Each structure stands twice: as structure tokens, then as C-alpha cells.
RNA sequence: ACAUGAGGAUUACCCAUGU
RNA sequence: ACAUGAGGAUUACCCAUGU
RNA sequence: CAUGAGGAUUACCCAUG
RNA sequence: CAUGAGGAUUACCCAUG
């Protein structure tokens, strides 16, 4: 099939969606950006390993900036005002089946679906109570 | 909010549903677990400190116990053969606003949402290509 | 060609067959698996580099789970009891033409081919006599 | 039955065949080779040994000759201008019955059956995309 | 998705036409070659680093060889007579736009269009007059 | 006749289209410059010479400006907020012929083409994938 | 001597790292 | 080089403890 | 690592900070 | 002078023989 393809990273309902397409898979991290000039994309790295002699390892990472203009020395550019970090870590033992791995993303869907704790702390500046 | 509830971790309609509830809250880090033995149970843990002085940090860690085959209520050893790890390092500058953080939520949302690379690869003992 | 497709790797007539598809392509290397956990899966990787000024080197390599008694989805240990390891490394010189290497594939063909001696003896768990 | 017999290396319907038949077995190691002077011959090697305390390894070798005259000081002489070498290990584990062992087998002649994705690129001076 | 197929590197009409595919792609550097004899064969390389904080710099090179038989001591080698050797290093700003870059490319093509100086004098054994 | 005369450098259709023009040509270096403030013009230099005995060497250059206007103490001038530098280095031997030649362009119009992999990955401010 | 290498070769040899 | 950290970051990098 | 109308056996070598 | 998937203020600088 071949999954490296690009997606929808911030879905706003057809208009204003953030969709990020394959850039690089130099060097076996594959990469995905947004559309914007190298300074401003939006950014997804993903790679897996076979960490212990009995695990696998995603490595994934993750990069929403936040747009800006800047003035330096008089001339404009497009740049990032800050960029907020997501990474993470999985780890599967080789035993896993495909129904067993399923399960573990339907749960990492679940952690993140809108209304659960989480989520909802995140996007309140809040932390779980 | 007071978002410290019981919730949904794995989904399947409402019939074989994997739910997490509160199970500790010491130290300030809080802790959902499902109802199993703690060594085939589902774990849920998350915290928030600030980083640094320009950022914040959430750090989200879940387990995902390995079904097919397993034993239920049995000793299932070794460990790193029954067992997934999942860590999440959520780093946001102090300037981000609630609305920054509902998109960075989004874009979470996204990166896993089912049919997109990232899950698909996982969900097939794959990587990418 | 545009070669990086699914095949069949076990060939059981139709019913029974081992088929093996893309999953993975991280720095270049080729990886093609079968249905199943990664502990029991078949694995075949596939890749080639000039080895030095006057040939070329494939690097092919496959692994083929024991079965008989095999516990499907199951934690089966010590792992090298229950897998076997195939691999093989294909120098060309510069010097060989499209058609060299069909030669070269033929007498590769020819060497596994069911009933001559090297596949005897494997498959009877027996050397030369 | 003796498995030690010639067989053909090189199919090509009966006509330009290239058959390889048992030359010599000392030292442990089984050799055939074509009917050619030793300087252009064909040659196969295999032998196995009980490696690990554990694991049974087949070591086979085989070298495809480019034939060719070469004029040395005044006289032709029967050589091969390059040769291509195939060498591959084969690691068993001792717990492997007939019927497991047949299964390599069948995985290695599938691995190169014609129209399979390596052959393929092989034989056209390709890697694997 | 890939950009890392095989394309036409020279076209002459339909056939005559010079093809490339991909052969390796380690270290991040990728890798295309032309058909049959290596010895013989075309080549095209191309990678991507930051080579500063403002800049990401290309680095692509190209290898055309002049075919030709090698009769030594009476043994003929398909051979290159010699090679043609191009090197380019593209250095691009990181607020470069999607946009930015499209005409950047667009300089390029046109720099090498024919009729143009450049490929002119090139293809006339000349230099500038 | 000379082959130092003004050229397309990018084609915009028949509007939007920049223009090189013979600036200099001191020391063997053909120069050429798009008009208007110099500041922001396009530059493409040229040259040749005999690299060693066999061969000969030919060193193209070209500068795309990023079009801006700078405001410095309240005094704006005409500037480029930035340049991609292009730099190639193409090296022949002395017994290419006039066809020879004309088949290196070809390669190197063919490398740049549209659709091909690299001018496609640069204007996609990516990599090889 | 094993083990490991998408390590090399004049191809039943050699190299490097590990024990 | 792994392993571990509710360790840090300019974010495919660094730090500390462990072997 | 960065520059060279610096050479090549073409992802290497050299001068120079 | 020659190599570098060596940087640039882009016919310059640097490492390396």
C-alpha cells in the first residue's frame, strides 16, 4: 500500500485544516510538514527501532508552531513566535499481535478523544483534579 | 475544570469498552487504572510542571497489557513480554493561550486519528514506507 | 522496476500460502512481513551497495518461524528455539550485464530447486552422504 | 538414498544447461562443479555444522564464472574474466522438524521464484522501490 | 508516496531515452543508476542538510559515461572510455515559501534551456563569446 | 555572433518574466544581471578552463533574490531580504565530441525537469522520501 | 574459538566490535 | 551504547544516575 | 564545519580561517 | 592546483594530500 501519505494534522471541518505531507525519509526517520516556508511548518518525524532484543520502539515527535512576522534589520520574515513540543516514546514487545497493537492505539484514541480529562485539561492551562 | 474522572480508554461500542478510573493522587500525579490485576491492568498517569521558564510540561504516560494469549488474573512473566509503554512529553510556552492549546489538542487528535500513517503503521507491526 | 510489492513467500497452492507484504522502508532497506505478531512472523529484508570498486553486493535475509507446536499469538521462549535465519549475500561485478545477472538468478533458482541435493538435505535435517 | 548426486544449476531447457555434478567431499565440506577446466568451472559447496549448543548451520557457497580467453605472454589460456559469488547461512534450531524444515525450503524457492520482487530486481541491475 | 521513483534522464524520442532508478539510499543520500552493466551505467545522487540555522543546503551530482568495449590480453569488458561529471549545491534560506522555491527551480530550468547561453556553449565544446 | 546575449532566466509566461542581461565578462567570467536596483537583480556567472590535461571544467553560478524593501531609521531602500545560491561545477574530457555534449545537457535538462524527483523535492522544500 | 556487522575479498579466506 | 528520570532544550539534541 | 572560475580515481583529496 | 552530502558575506573562507 505504502503508508507513507500525507494527512489532515489539525482538522477544522474542510476550512482552515492543517494538513501535513511527506518532506524526507532521509536517513530512516520519515518526515512530514505543512505547507509553509521551512521557518513557519508545521512538523511530524516518526521512526521505529528494535530496541531490546525482544522490543520495538516508535519514536515519534511532533511540532505546532506558532506563525508570526518578524522585522530583522529593517526587512520582514515569516517566522515562528515559539513552537510547542509533542514527543513520544512506544514500546511493544515482539510478541504483540496486530489485534494486540490495534488495541493499544484504539486506547491512545481514547486518552486524547475530546471531553476525556486529559484533552480537556490541556486545552484549559490546566492540570488533572 | 475538575477533570479528575473516570472515563473510556479503549472503545468498542459500549460492549467490551476498556474503562480507566481514578485509582491515586499522590504527589499531585494522577492515576487511572482499569479493574484487573496491577500487572494486567490499564494504566493512565499525567502531570504538569513548568519546564522552564518559558515553558510548560506535560508528561502523560499510559500501559497497555498484551491480550492475545493472556491469562486473566494469572502470573504472566516475563514482564516485558506482557506489557506496552507509552510516554508523552507535551512541552508549550507560557504564552500559549487556551485556544493555542484546543489546536495543539487538535493536532494530537489528528496525528493518531484512525486512517492516518502514524496508527496505521503501529496497528500493523509496521513502520513506514 | 517498481518492484516494492506483496508476494508469496510459502506457496501452499493457494490454500495454506505465506504471503509477505511491505512493511517498512527505512534507509533503503527493503522489508516485507507476514501477517503476525513480530515474534512469529516471516521476515524478509532486501538491499544493495557497491561492496567495493568491482562489484555490487546484495544482502538478502529471511526469517522463518518453527511452527509445529507453535502456539499462534502466544509468548514463545527462548526465542532462538523457535526461529530460523536465512542469509545471503549476492557479489556481482561491475562487469555483469542485465542478462549475467539472469544467469545468476537461474543458478540461484537451480540450487534451491525441489529435488536437487542443498534443499534435500535441509528439508530432511540432514547433510551430504 | 545418498543425496550427493549432480544436478542442473542452470536450466535452460534442456539445451545450454549448465550442470553441476559431486566433485569432492573432503574435509566435511561437498563441492561440485561443471565439467570445465577448474579455471572456469562452476563450483557449489555446502556443509553443516552443530554450531550453537542449540542451532544446526548450513554453510552454502556458490561461484557463477564469466568464461573467457585470455592471451598470457603469447599463449591462450582458458579463465574466467570475473566471477560472482553467492554465499549464504542457513541457522536451524535443533527443535525443528521435517515438516518446519520444508517450510524454509519453500520460503527460499518462493523468495526467488520468477516474478517475485528480488529476482526481479537482480537480474535488472536494480535495487528494491 | 515517493519521490524516490524511477525517472528519465535523458530523452531521446521514446527509445534511446536514458532511464534511472533507484539503487540505495544510506546515509541519506540517494541514489539512481541506469540499467545493464554498472561499469556502464548512469548515475544520479541528491541529499538535503541544514547547513546553517538560516540555510538548508542541496547537494545533487550527476554522472554521464562515454560506453565502450575494453579488449585486454585478448578479454573484452563493457566499459566507460571516461566520464562526464556534474556537481551542483543549491543553498536555500529557511523563509523560503513554497512559492519561493517553485521559482527558484523555474531559474534553473531556464538557465539550462535550449538556446540558452549556457547550454549552448556547453554542448558546442565552447565557452563564452 | 556571440552566445553572451540576454536571456530568459525565468519564465513566467510572457509577463512576469526575468531577464539577464551581459553585465561584465573581466577574467574569462561571463556575468549576467536582471535590471533594476542592482540590490535585487538576478545574477548568473559562467566560465571554463582546461582542469588538467584530460579534461576540461566548466564553474555556472546563479543568485535568485528574495525582493524586499528595508526601512532603517526611518530610510527605506530597495533589497533583498535574502538569496538561494546555486553553484555547479561540470567536468568533461577532451575527447567528448560535439554530440558527446549534447547528450550531457540533455541529462542535465532531464535532471531538472518537471515531475522529475529533485526539481520537484527542492520546490517542495523537501527531501528525498 | 564462538557471537554480531545492509563488513571486505583473490572466495572454505580476511577485518572490526562483543564475550 | 543501551536502561532509567512527573530530567532540560535552540527539538532526531543535551544532562544525570545505573550496567 | 565554512570559501576557492581549486584537482579527482567523483559523497574523495588539497590550499586557505 | 586536486577531493569534501565542508560553511559563506557567494568567483571568497576552511579541513585535508
Known sequence: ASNFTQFVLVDNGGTGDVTVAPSNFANGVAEWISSNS?????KVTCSVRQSSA???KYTIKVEV???ATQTVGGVE????????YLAMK???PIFATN??????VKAMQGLLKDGNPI???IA???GIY
Open 90 to 92: 512506544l514500546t511493544i
Open 124 to 126: 484549559a492551562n490546566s
Open 38 to 42: 521551512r521557518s513557519q511548518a508545521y
Open 54 to 56: 525482544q522490543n520495538r
Open 99 to 104: 489485534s494486540d497493537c490495534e488495541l493499544i
Open 65 to 67: 508552531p506558532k506563525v
Open 119 to 121: 484533552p480537556s485539561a
Open 77 to 84: 520574515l515569516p517566522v515562528a513566535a515559539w513552537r510547542s
